[PDB]
Design a protein around this nucleic acid. Structure first.
Lengths: 55, 112, 96, 120, 100, 68
RNA sequence: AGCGUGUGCCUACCCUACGCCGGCAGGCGCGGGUAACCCGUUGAACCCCAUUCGUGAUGGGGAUCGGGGAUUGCAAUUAUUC
RNA sequence: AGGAGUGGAGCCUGCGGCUUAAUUUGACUCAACACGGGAAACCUCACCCGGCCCGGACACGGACAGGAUUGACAGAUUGAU
């Protein structure tokens, strides 16, 4: 029963159901407004998104 | 994502920038480079390949995406192209002081 | 590999008609977003064209999660004399 | 000499009743657990666990059956049964007394050793 | 036919340029044009730490986006205002057409 | 890494030589016979064969088990 | 009162007026919002007024602990939470 | 000059130490200690006890359609159909 017990674990909810869409890590995710990455990747690619640190 | 795309392929082409312009039921992506003959490839093979992969990756309709490749004016004023030129100069194997002095002097007579 | 014969040739004429390939990197995707008519995962697809990389017929570069396999002229010859086609049908990357 | 009574009913009375009223005979969490759904999605292990418990040794000490399921609520039908449940390292072989009802197998297998400090 | 057009963008100066050009065009086309309704702008504030690891003085960024939305109302048939709205659109300014 | 526990091995499958002649049996006359029973399923049709065990009858890929 | 946020790609998981049942935690058919329109005029708290308390480990303080009932999740026991 | 405090009381969280089969680890004056956006029931997980699969490509030599191999239900088994 390798096929039916290989990934029968439900990852429907929880932290590991989502991941970073830049580098695929599961720590420090930003889910607000659907960015779906960690803080470092947003800080590195924040200029081309259009977010400016005016304040 | 399109910016990191085009700097992954067009590193040897001397990449500088990207522009996206919106049209009703049509997507326009303008590619800014310096080797405007090497970006097409032989008979426009590679730009058609890039159009096909961006259309299949981003869920775009068939026959609505096209790529225009126009080279940038004032080559010595875009810092990205000089950075990739210095990267390919140091990658082939050459003294770092000669290469940095050459890029510094080229930016200096280029009008900056 | 435990791949059926139909899946390998299926990715083969999908690559032969259009010489481009995009796939998101995950092993638990039950059906391809393009090949949902039949049953094939992405893991078969990446391991098959990784074998094609190791035999030396395609190029490769990686985005965030998306692979990008490109076709070569010797790859066109290999797919031509593997899928047993007459040499007048061309991939769409060359003909305009 | 004392006779055990649970909620006003006797042991054989508890055996010869069903889950549809046994949920109200249980507490709040156990009613929610048994009324959640069918024991099929992950508790086919529980199905075959009560099957292996329903396997009957003869009139002696019953044979021990061991499992990794720490989330098993003690039904009245499995009183007087011999079981060892996994705490992560070994199996603590425990006698099911007629008092287990309303608990888990994790209530009766300790994980941490009781600490005995020495010198800092 | 009552028609509503929305001028939503990220930059504000090109927004003022295209809204002034659209109002001027509706003025010279002899059409009843309403004034530009300025909606309250929305500020995109998300804050994060500076350093990638966990050491240092606890310092934070304040990244900001401002999106401005404008409303122009007209009383006109469909094809003429399609001809007007499909003229000289900026890449940083998004226009969307709605009909009541 | 060799440990104190003994090493387990996988199935080295027993090799059978020309088992197809044990599917049919041929006589001295001109007829063809079926020694074992044929599975009556639709996709598990008229090509495959089915076992002969000591207590049960089981097929190959359609998994229909029959016993007395 | 004021900053806000709100139906998400693989990704399913949104914010909620209104009616009934129940002390309550909560439950069902019902309507809006992909948002200055709907929650919403965000009837917020501290404060204000009127009783009860009277220097007492007290009606201060709510730690520890027993019993019971709902919600989330495939799963709560080393009590998820209420 | 002052105000509000902390340090004393109960509780939450983090660090050291002790126990453990594991109690994963980085950081130790400002500039480590509600820090790693680290509010861990499963994933997270990188620590311990157990068992599967290859997801070991490509090239060489055996092997081989007379068979290279894959999948599986009576019943024991561990943990599981």
């Amino acid at each position: 029963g390798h096929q039916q017990l290989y990934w029968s674990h439900p990852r429907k909810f929880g932290q590991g159901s989502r991941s970073c869409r830049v580098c695929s890590n599961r720590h420090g995710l930003i889910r607000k407004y659907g960015l779906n990455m960690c803080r470092q990747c947003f800080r590195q690619y924040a200029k081309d998104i259009g977010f400016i640190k005016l304040d | 994502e399109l910016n990191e795309f085009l700097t992954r392929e067009l590193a040897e082409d001397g990449y500088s920038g990207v522009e996206v312009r919106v049209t009703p039921t049509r997507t326009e992506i303008i590619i800014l480079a310096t080797r405007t003959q090497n970006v097409l490839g032989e008979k426009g093979r590679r730009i058609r390949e890039l159009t096909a992969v961006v259309q299949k990756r981003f869920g775009f309709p068939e026959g609505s995406v096209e790529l225009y490749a126009e080279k940038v004016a004032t080559r010595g004023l875009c810092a990205i192209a000089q950075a990739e030129s210095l990267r390919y100069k140091l990658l082939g194997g050459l003294a770092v002081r000669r290469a940095c002095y050459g890029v510094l002097r080229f930016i200096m007579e280029s009008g900056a | 590999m435990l791949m059926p014969k139909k899946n390998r040739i299926a990715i083969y004429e999908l690559l032969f008609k259009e010489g481009v390939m995009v796939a998101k990197k995950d092993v638990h995707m039950p059906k391809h977003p393009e090949l949902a008519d039949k049953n094939v995962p992405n893991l078969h697809v990446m391991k098959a064209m990784q074998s094609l990389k190791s035999r030396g017929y395609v190029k490769e570069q990686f985005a965030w999660r998306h692979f990008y396999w490109y076709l070569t002229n010797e790859g066109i010859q290999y797919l031509r004399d593997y899928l047993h086609l007459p040499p007048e049908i061309v991939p769409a990357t060359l003909r305009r | 000499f004392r006779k055990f009574t649970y909620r006003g009913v006797d042991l054989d009375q508890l055996l010869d009743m069903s889950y549809e009223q046994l949920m109200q005979l249980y507490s709040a969490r156990q009613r929610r657990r048994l009324s959640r759904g069918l024991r099929r999605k992950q508790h086919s292990l529980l199905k075959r666990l009560r099957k292996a418990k329903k396997e009957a040794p003869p009139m002696e000490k019953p044979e021990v059956v061991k499992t990794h399921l720490r989330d098993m609520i003690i039904l009245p039908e499995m009183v007087g049964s011999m079981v060892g449940v996994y705490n992560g390292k070994t199996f603590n072989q425990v006698e099911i007394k007629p008092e287990m009802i309303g608990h888990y197998l994790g209530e009766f297998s300790i994980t941490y050793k009781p600490v005995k400090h020495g010198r800092p | 036919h009552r028609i509503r057009i929305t001028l939503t963008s990220r930059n504000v100066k090109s927004l003022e340029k295209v809204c002034a050009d659209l109002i001027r065009g509706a003025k010279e086309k002899n059409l009843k044009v309403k004034g530009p309704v300025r909606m309250p702008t929305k500020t995109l504030r998300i804050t994060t730490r500076k350093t990638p690891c966990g050491e240092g003085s606890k310092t934070w960024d304040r990244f900001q986006m401002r999106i401005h939305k404008r409303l122009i109302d007209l009383h006109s048939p469909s094809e003429i205002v399609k001809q007007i709205t499909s003229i000289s659109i900026e890449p940083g300014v998004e226009v969307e057409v709605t009909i009541a | 890494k060799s440990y104190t526990t003994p090493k387990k091995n996988k199935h080295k499958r027993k090799k059978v030589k020309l088992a197809v002649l044990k599917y049919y049996k041929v006589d001295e006359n001109g007829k063809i016979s079926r020694l074992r029973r044929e599975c009556p399923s639709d996709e598990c049709g008229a090509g495959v064969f089915m076992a002969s065990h000591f207590d049960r009858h089981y097929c190959g890929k359609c998994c229909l088990t029959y016993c007395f």
